[PDB]
Design an enzyme around this catalytic site. Structure first.
Site, PDB file in Angstrom:
ATOM      1  N   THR A  50     -16.953  -5.438   7.598  1.00 34.26           N
ATOM      2  CA  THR A  50     -17.100  -4.008   7.361  1.00 34.26           C
ATOM      3  C   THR A  50     -17.501  -3.738   5.916  1.00 34.26           C
ATOM      4  OG1 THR A  50     -14.857  -3.452   6.646  1.00 34.26           O
ATOM      5  CG2 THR A  50     -15.218  -3.832   8.995  1.00 34.26           C
ATOM      6  N   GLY A 110      -9.424  -4.055  -1.892  1.00 35.62           N
ATOM      7  CA  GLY A 110      -8.828  -3.906  -3.204  1.00 35.62           C
ATOM      8  C   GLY A 110      -7.337  -4.164  -3.238  1.00 35.62           C
ATOM      9  N   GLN A 132      -4.118  -2.770   3.974  1.00 38.89           N
ATOM     10  CA  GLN A 132      -4.238  -2.289   5.345  1.00 38.89           C
ATOM     11  C   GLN A 132      -3.976  -3.405   6.344  1.00 38.89           C
ATOM     12  OE1 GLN A 132      -5.837   0.997   6.740  1.00 38.89           O
ATOM     13  NE2 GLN A 132      -4.682   0.103   8.441  1.00 38.89           N
ATOM     14  N   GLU A 174       9.280 -29.051   4.510  1.00 44.38           N
ATOM     15  CA  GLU A 174       8.377 -30.156   4.802  1.00 44.38           C
ATOM     16  C   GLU A 174       7.027 -29.676   5.321  1.00 44.38           C
ATOM     17  OE1 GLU A 174      10.695 -29.492   6.947  1.00 44.38           O
ATOM     18  OE2 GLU A 174       9.546 -29.243   8.795  1.00 44.38           O
ATOM     19  N   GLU A 213      -3.302   3.733  -0.602  1.00 37.62           N
ATOM     20  CA  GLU A 213      -3.633   4.805   0.324  1.00 37.62           C
ATOM     21  C   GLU A 213      -2.423   5.094   1.202  1.00 37.62           C
ATOM     22  OE1 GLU A 213      -6.738   3.498   2.940  1.00 37.62           O
ATOM     23  OE2 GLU A 213      -6.221   1.376   2.747  1.00 37.62           O
TER      24      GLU A 213
END
Ligand SMILES: Nc1nc2c(ncn2[C@@H]2O[C@H](COP(=O)(O)OP(=O)(O)OP(=O)(O)O)[C@@H](O)[C@H]2O)c(=O)[nH]1
Ligand SMILES: Nc1nc2c(ncn2[C@@H]2O[C@H](COP(=O)(O)OP(=O)(O)O)[C@@H](O)[C@H]2O)c(=O)[nH]1
Ligand SMILES: [Mg+2]
Lengths: 65, 436, 426, 63
Positions: B178, B143, B10, B253, B70
């Site tokens: 959250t 996840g 997400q 670099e 999702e």
């Protein structure tokens, strides 16, 4: 909760003071190094200055004759 | 000189949605995928060729794959205002969510869509001829970001090897978060980020909220406000590969200059001037002031006070009219300051790059147009605080073996739980050992 | 007769040499179009030294432009006086170096040196008689240092009896553009002290100080530092390109300024340096030129001579002037700074006079100096190298690319013994 | 009560650190003053070097 907030603020402030302290200590080491180096350079310069006086005195001794 | 982007989760997809807008606007590309005809801005016949292709008949397509499990976010993008910009196959959407489960995202569901994702990467990279490296955007608080992200890093490092991987990884905020089971996923994703990424720019959320409430003066921000400035940072980092300048700095670099050890690669990011449209013209914004505002402690995208440790290597990218003289003077003042102490073994600490393109602006944003901007990427030793802080609240959960059944029901093991625990221990020990 | 071929790479090398080619083309009188538009035949009699006419009055410089990245070569072709370089001189690098001496000297060299050496051999044998090689580069960069020293070594192996004049910018602690500066500088000095014939070591903080004080330029930039540095490169071959009462070629300069083979690190100066706000309120002749040229702050190096002594020095005057006044000025300044000239080498200063002053001027004086105070720059580079190498920081990027630490120690001890011999000559 | 006690200990500690910092910065100012004075002395000595060298050469040229 409020007391814990101000405690955290105090910890942050004292760690800032500590970091300023040891930064200043390292700056002290640095500045002492330049102090020694610069006294050495000035001593070489004044040694050359004193050497010239003897040479000019010898030149005067040889010019008198 | 072409670089591709992969967005996982997400957070990654949302940041990419708020970044490709900036990219197309900066290069003048219309949202439907083709440049206009009469209006002409800049000369960019190959200044677009880094992030965009050109499908022959004037239709640029980004070098990026969005991927999610999702499908809600992916089809939101597919129906959004950028239907035509993306290729109809670089937006990969699986079926079922990973649901704050690293095990479900890395073992069960992840192992059935990475096969398509990296095949798309293969037949996307075959189209380039000057590939530089990858950059990944993911959140380790969930996840898809942790599990699928770690799997993709593994199966891309094993495949393409030497090429650099600029990670832009969102760690959880210290106390604001959250998700609740997120420390587990954080440690599990750390044990794959440590040994598979060359440079991992960290990003936090309380830090950015603090920035956008102190400087930007927006007391009710949101993700549309965070991702905009994250995209600003990305663009300032990668401007050089698209725009010529007084002193161009490219992606090699950033590693051969900011990564003194094979494992100590963790970037604090900062950007100045984060300013509004009212203070802007009333403040005289020059190099010294913008650099000081970049280096103040409360201007970092990650919430950690960079006064505890020492700076190992700073990199400052300047956009806009900046001369070498005044930037040299500014970094001299930064060295002279008494608040930050550099590490001892690194006397020269900064690398400054310059580019002539002024910072862009998105109509509807909070950052008003300014003449110049500075973005700092700094390798420091004050990230051990972050790692140990996350470690303690991982241990608190792991003592009771809470939530562990959700992981063992998909394939995790307490073996690798303790493995990641001791991995974080070794990393923070390494920070302690290198600081001295 | 005598022919110079120019070699140029890295951002410093390419930009500085672009400004050099601009200056010399304007001085000989050719326009950026590539055709001659001057009047005096003195501008044509010696065009061969820098140019090879192709067809119909179209002149092409005898330069080689080398880089691993198109980002600088596209810019130099975009810039003015860039439509004259032959495209064959563009050995075209695709990848880049990224501030890595190992990459520049052991990985990219393998596949670029063959092409660049074949091109430079073509250029050298394309003339009648070589006078030598004029190379410009850096020490702290990626391509100019590593690949530059690689090509320098290869040319020193191929042509063993042709002179080599390097114009190498040396990093300064005040201006810290990168962080691999110590390693790059050390590993480039390792090659330079053994293969390069003579090296003009230069820096940027001295140039910025010059622009602050002696030019009063409020906003100096690389586009003016490169001009200021290119002035001396254009002036060092005034004898080669022009007549004069007392000529002196590069061989003359080297045999006058190199008492021992391990002493080829000189400092540079240029006079007169005056702002446009004072060009109308000053007098120009030998006494003031001598004062400005022997001024300690006029040096383009981060090495003030007043902490050391001059082994030797040389002046190249351009413009009609009395050699009597020139000689008396040199003798007078020698007596004035007797303590700054090594005693057992009498007549430490050599002079040379040419005929044509630089365009837009009535008189000029370039200065070269071999003094034992140049070891300060190498000391403050070696201190950084030690402070880095003790921790073995930034070391994996090199050591994972065929290198090890033995040659690190070799370069370190090289500078140690070099500064030691400079001191024991002091 | 425990948190307030910790607060007081922290404030005492930071006060001690601040006092040490103040003395350190004062000593730094003293060092910089000594810097400037000694550099001035070196300039004077160098001028004396030049003048005495010229006198030496002028006197010797007679012999
Ligand atoms: N700063 C910032 N963080 C975001 C944004 N979008 C999502 N996040 C972070 O993403 C975290 C949610 O967990 P994710 O890793 O994104 O999980 P996911 O991508 O939805 O995939 P799943 O875990 O399977 O649900 C939150 O804690 C946020 O901090 C964003 O736009 N800006
Ligand atoms: N005088 C001058 N110096 C420059 C300029 N650009 C870069 N430099 C210096 O050159 C060094 C970098 O060398 P670099 O170009 O990276 O070498 P390369 O990678 O081998 O081509 C830095 O330390 C800068 O200080 C310029 O335009 N003018
Ligand atoms: Mg999700």
């Amino acid at each position: 909760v409020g007391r814990k907030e101000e405690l955290e603020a105090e910890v942050v402030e004292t760690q800032a003071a500590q970091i300023q302290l040891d930064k200043a200590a390292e700056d002290f080491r640095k500045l002492h190094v330049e102090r020694q180096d610069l006294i050495r350079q000035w001593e070489e310069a004044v040694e050359a200055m004193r050497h010239r006086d003897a040479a000019i005195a010898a030149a005067s001794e040889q010019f008198a004759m | 000189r072409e670089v591709i982007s992969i967005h996982i989760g997400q957070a990654g997809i949302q940041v990419g949605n708020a970044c490709w807008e900036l990219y197309c606007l900066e290069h003048g590309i219309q949202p439907d995928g083709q440049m206009p005809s009469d209006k002409t801005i800049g000369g960019g016949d190959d200044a677009f060729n880094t992030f965009f292709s050109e499908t022959g008949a004037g239709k640029h397509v980004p070098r990026c794959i969005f991927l999610d499990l999702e499908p809600t976010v992916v089809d939101e993008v597919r129906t959004g205002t950028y239907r035509q910009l993306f290729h109809p196959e670089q937006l990969i959407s699986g079926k079922e969510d990973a649901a704050n489960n690293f095990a479900r995202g890395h073992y069960t569901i992840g192992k059935e869509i990475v096969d398509l994702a990296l095949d798309r990467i293969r037949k996307l990279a075959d189209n380039c001829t000057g590939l530089q490296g990858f950059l990944v955007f993911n959140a380790v608080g969930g996840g898809t970001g942790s599990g699928l992200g770690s799997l993709l890093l593994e199966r891309l490092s094993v495949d393409y090897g030497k090429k650099s991987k600029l990670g832009f990884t969102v760690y959880p905020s210290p106390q604001v978060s959250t998700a609740v089971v997120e420390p587990y996923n954080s440690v599990l994703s750390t044990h794959s980020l440590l040994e598979h990424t060359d440079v991992a720019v960290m990003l936090d959320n309380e830090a950015i909220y603090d920035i956008c409430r102190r400087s930007l003066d927006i007391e009710r921000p949101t993700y549309t406000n965070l991702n905009r400035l994250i995209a600003q940072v990305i663009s300032s980092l990668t401007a050089s590969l698209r725009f010529d300048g007084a002193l161009n700095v490219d992606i090699t670099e950033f590693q051969t200059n900011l990564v003194p050890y094979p494992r100590i690669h963790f970037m604090l990011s900062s950007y100045a001037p984060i300013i509004s449209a009212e203070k802007a013209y009333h403040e005289q914004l020059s190099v010294a002031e913008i650099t000081n505002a970049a280096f103040e402690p409360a201007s970092m995208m990650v919430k950690c006070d960079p006064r505890h440790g020492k700076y190992m290597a700073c990199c400052l990218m300047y956009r806009g009219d900046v001369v070498p003289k005044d930037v040299n003077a500014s970094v001299a003042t930064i060295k002279t300051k008494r608040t930050i102490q550099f590490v001892d073994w690194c006397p020269t600490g900064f690398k400054c790059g310059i580019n002539y393109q002024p910072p862009t602006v998105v109509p509807g944003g909070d950052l008003a147009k300014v003449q110049r901007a500075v973005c700092m990427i700094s390798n420091s030793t004050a990230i051990g605080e972050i790692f140990s802080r996350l470690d303690h609240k991982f241990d608190l959960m792991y003592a009771k073996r809470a939530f562990v059944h959700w992981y063992v029901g998909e394939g995790m093991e307490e073996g690798e739980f303790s493995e990641a625990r001791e991995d974080l221990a070794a990393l923070e020990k390494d920070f302690e050992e290198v600081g001295a | 007769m005598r022919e110079i071929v120019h070699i140029q790479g890295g951002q410093c090398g390419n930009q500085i040499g672009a400004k050099f080619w601009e200056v010399v083309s304007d001085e000989h009188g050719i326009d950026p179009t590539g055709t001659y538009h001057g009047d005096s035949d003195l501008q044509l009699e010696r065009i061969n030294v820098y140019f090879n006419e192709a067809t119909g009055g179209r002149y092409v410089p005898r330069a080689i432009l080398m880089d691993l990245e198109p980002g600088t070569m596209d810019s130099v072709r975009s810039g003015p006086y860039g439509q004259i370089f032959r495209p064959d001189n563009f050995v075209f690098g695709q990848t880049g170096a990224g501030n890595n001496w190992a990459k520049g000297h052991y990985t990219e060299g393998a596949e670029l040196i063959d092409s660049v050496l074949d091109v430079v051999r073509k250029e050298a044998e394309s003339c009648d008689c070589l006078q030598g090689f004029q190379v410009c580069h850096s020490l702290g960069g990626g391509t100019g240092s590593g690949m530059g020293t690689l090509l320098i070594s290869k040319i020193r192996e191929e042509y063993p009896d042709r002179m080599m004049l390097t114009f190498s910018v040396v990093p300064s602690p005040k201006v810290s553009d990168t962080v691999v500066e110590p390693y790059n500088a050390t590993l480039s000095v390792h090659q330079l002290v053994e293969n390069a014939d003579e090296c003009m070591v230069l820096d940027n903080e001295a140039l910025y100080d010059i622009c602050f004080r002696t030019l009063k330029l409020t906003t100096p930039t690389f586009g003016d530092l490169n001009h200021l540095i290119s002035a001396v490169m254009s002036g060092i071959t005034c004898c080669l390109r022009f007549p004069g009462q007392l000529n002196a070629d590069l061989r003359k300069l080297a045999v006058n300024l190199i008492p021992f083979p391990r002493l080829h690190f000189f400092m540079v100066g240029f006079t007169p340096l005056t702002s446009r706000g004072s060009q109308q309120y000053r007098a120009l002749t030998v006494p003031e030129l001598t004062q400005q040229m022997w001024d300690a702050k006029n040096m383009m190096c981060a090495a003030d001579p007043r902490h050391g002594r001059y082994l030797t020095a040389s002046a190249l005057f351009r413009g009609r002037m009395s050699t009597k006044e020139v000689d008396e000025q040199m003798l007078n300044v020698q007596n004035k700074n007797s303590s700054y000239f090594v005693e057992w080498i009498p007549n430490n200063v050599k002079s040379s006079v040419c005929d044509i002053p630089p365009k837009g001027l009535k008189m000029s004086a370039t200065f070269i100096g071999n003094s034992t105070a140049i070891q300060e720059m190498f000391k403050r580079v070696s201190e950084q190298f030690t402070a880095m190498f003790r921790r073995k920081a930034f070391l994996h990027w090199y050591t994972g690319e065929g290198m090890d630490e033995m040659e690190f120690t070799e370069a370190e001890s090289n500078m140690n013994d070099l500064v030691s011999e400079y001191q024991q000559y002091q | 009560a425990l948190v307030s006690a910790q607060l007081e200990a922290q404030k005492r500690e930071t006060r001690a650190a601040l006092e040490t910092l103040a003395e350190a910065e004062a000593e730094m100012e003293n060092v910089h003053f000594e810097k400037k004075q000694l550099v001035a002395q070196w300039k004077s000595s160098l001028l004396a070097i030049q003048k005495r060298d010229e006198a030496l050469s002028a006197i010797q040229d007679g012999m």
